[PDB]
Structure 1
Amino acid sequence: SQVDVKDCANHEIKKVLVPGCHGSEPCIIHRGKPFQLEAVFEANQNTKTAKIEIKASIDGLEVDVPGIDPNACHYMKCPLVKGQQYDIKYTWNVPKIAPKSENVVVTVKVMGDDGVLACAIATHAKIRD
């Protein structure tokens, strides 16, 4: 369970499941490029909305667009009050061999009602031998 991934906001998370690695290990990319990230993180304040923003740098082709819905407030008892667990998710399929297993690192974060909520990055996905 859990994989290496790293936080980029403020240890305000708890679990981030993404297709690729599963721990300190090394995981390449099985071709076919879908981006499905799912994470749980408690809220540390009050808020009536929380968007989602994926920032992915894939072999010089850093994508800069949203591939899903980022406001689960139209999906769950809004507004969200502090201490309440909040899980965000994203899943968008894409060309099977567009990016070049070499050099891609994704960092996606959910921004609540004040700008921030839970953010986690991931990488381990290149090509060699």
Structure 2
Amino acid sequence: DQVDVKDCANNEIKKVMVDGCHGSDPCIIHRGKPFTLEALFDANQNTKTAKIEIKASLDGLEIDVPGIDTNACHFMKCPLVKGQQYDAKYTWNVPKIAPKSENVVVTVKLVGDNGVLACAIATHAKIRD
């Protein structure tokens, strides 16, 4: 369902959805299984590129989020047009060995030729079995 996120750019993101999660409820991420999200955002520039930058911290420790194709143009119709609305969807296989945590912070940035396209900080994720 639609979930609560904090915007870390200029509110370009209009809606974020995460399969199995809702609003500001703790969003359970079951390690070893597919995690799917979808976000709608308005492009704030004309750009040939769109690159995903992700940061995740578990109980304060930064960790590397492996296996993500950071070229969003591999899944959106680039070049992106200023003012147009894009539907970004991603399904990521959560590694079975990801450490369980009840205190997760994930920052996902999207960057274009001329700066940040979008940015959201998620603080409700919980990694469990």
TM-score (norm 1): 0.77
Residue of structure 1 in register with 2:104 after alignment: 104
1:115 positional shift? 2.3
1:116 positional shift? 0.8
**Are positions 1:84 and 2:75 aligned together?**
no
Contact 1:59 1:104 in 2 (8 A): yes
Residue 89 of structure 2 aligns with an amino acid whose one-letter code is K
Q: Percent same amino acid at aligned positions?
A: 87
Q: Which has the higher strand share?
A: 2
* Structure 2: distance between partners of 1:32 and 1:65: 14
Q: Which runs of 5+ in 1 are unaligned?
A: none
**Are positions 1:58 and 2:58 aligned together?**
yes
Task: Give the 3-state SS of the residue equivalent to 2:6 in structure 1.
Answer: coil
TM-score (norm 2): 0.77
* Structure 2: distance between partners of 1:66 and 1:29: 15
* Structure 2: distance between partners of 1:31 and 1:14: 28
Q: Which runs of 5+ in 2 are unaligned?
A: none
For this pair of structures, how many residues does the alignment match? 127
Residue of structure 2 in register with 1:73 after alignment: 73
**Are positions 1:45 and 2:45 aligned together?**
yes
Residue 43 of structure 2 aligns with an amino acid whose one-letter code is A
* Structure 2: distance between partners of 1:76 and 1:98: 28
